Amino acid sequence: SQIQFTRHASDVLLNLNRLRSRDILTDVVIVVSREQFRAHKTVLMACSGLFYSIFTDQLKRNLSVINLDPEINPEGFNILLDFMYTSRLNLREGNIMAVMATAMYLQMEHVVDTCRKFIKAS
Amino acid sequence: SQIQFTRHASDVLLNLNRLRSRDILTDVVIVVSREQFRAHKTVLMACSGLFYSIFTDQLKRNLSVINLDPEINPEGFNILLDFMYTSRLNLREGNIMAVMATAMYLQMEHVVDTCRKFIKAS
Ligand SMILES: Cn1cnc2c(c(-c3ccc(O)c(C#N)c3)cn2CC(=O)Nc2ccncc2Cl)c1=O
Ligand SMILES: Cn1cnc2c(c(-c3ccc(O)c(C#N)c3)cn2CC(=O)Nc2ccncc2Cl)c1=O
């Protein structure tokens, strides 16, 4: 019987993104080939099967640096990181294969399915 | 022109709450009279003018314990903490004055306004 605040979750996510943009309480750097992306591990865990499985393990929970597989496309990763923090996916013909492969690796099922739909609708 | 994922923010918030429930990557304990509540500072900052102002300051950013004002009602605080992590506000006649006073202190304007509406609709 709770009062539902329909914009609250999106307001929270927006504010988490503004914290990321100011590097406030970020606790990990994700290294992808020659690039580095700082983030909150809690957001990564909340959005990715791969990052959940990594940080839930007490062996790895306190890691401050994660190196992704050398084959991962940095643009694809950046698109997905932005998606995590915004709910918006920048999917185009020039990046769709890279985004889909990256989302498979990150274990983000809704985005992989959306990539399949994009391929089908094209 | 981004594809919008309408359930993503609520999915993220739900997963942040499950992390809280397992005490995974919580970095602060909020002490309210005789009670203690663990939380993520990033979520607190994202939801509260008071917590934003506290932790944005480098003087206080790394605090692991925050003691709230002794007058703050623990039930009211718990209701608002749950709201932060769920978008659901448990507002009733028996708790409305305590919730409204706590939301004023925490600087959560939408909840204070909702408390005003509850009082008016009653
Ligand atoms: C396949 N797969 C596996 N794991 C996933 C996801 C997503 C997800 C969330 C929103 C999305 O928009 C998309 C997309 N696209 C994907 C998140 N997680 C991690 C997870 O469940 N964490 C968790 C579990 C239990 N308690 C606490 C926590 Cl933090 C996923 O898709
Ligand atoms: C009055 N007031 C002041 N500050 C507030 C809020 C809310 C808020 C959010 C969702 C809600 O559902 C409710 C309610 N009810 C209240 C959050 N914040 C903190 C904030 O803006 N943080 C921030 C600012 C800039 N960059 C990064 C960050 Cl993290 C507020 O209401």
Q: If you measure from the C-alpha of residue A12 to the centroid of ligand 2, how many angstroms do you get, rounded to a whole number?
A: 8
Neighbours of B103 (CB within 10 A): 24
State how far the alpha carbon of B108 is from the alpha carbons of A2, B48, B105, B111, in Å: 17, 5, 8, 6
B9: chain A residues, CB-CB within 8 Å: 9-10, 12-13, 87
Q: If you measure from the C-alpha of residue B86 to the centroid of ligand 2, how many angstroms do you get, rounded to a whole number?
A: 15
**B33 in Cβ contact with B72 (< 8 Å):** yes
- Tell me if residue A42 falls in helix, strand or coil: helix
- Tell me if residue A54 falls in helix, strand or coil: helix
Residue B113 Cβ inside 6 Å of ligand 2? The answer reads no
- Domain extent for A120: 1-122
- Sign of the C-alpha dihedral, residues B36, A61, B41, B9? negative
- The count of structural domains within chain A is 1
Residue with tokens 């448990």: B90
The residue whose C-alpha atom lies closest to atom 16 belonging to ligand 1 is A108
**B47 in Cβ contact with B109 (< 8 Å):** no
B19 token code pair: 């992390």
Residue A11 Cβ inside 6 Å of ligand 2? The answer reads yes
The experimental resolution of this structure, in angstroms, equals 1.2
Residues ≥6 apart with Cβ < 8 Å to A105: A50, A68, A69, A72
Burial class (CB in 10 A: 0-12, 13-18, 19+), B63: middle
Residues ≥6 apart with Cβ < 8 Å to A73: A98, A101, A102
**Which amino acid belongs to residue A86?**
T
Burial class (CB in 10 A: 0-12, 13-18, 19+), A40: buried
Length of chain A: 122
Give me the helices (H) in B6-122, please.
8-21, 41-47, 49-56, 74-86, 96-106, 109-120
Residue B50 Cβ inside 6 Å of ligand 2? The answer reads no
Q: What is the DSSP string of B2-32?
A: PEE-TTHHHHHHHHHHHHHHTT-S--EEEEE
Distance CA B65, CA B80 (A): 18
Q: What is the DSSP letter of A2?
A: P
Quick check: A45 and B56 CB within 8 A?
no
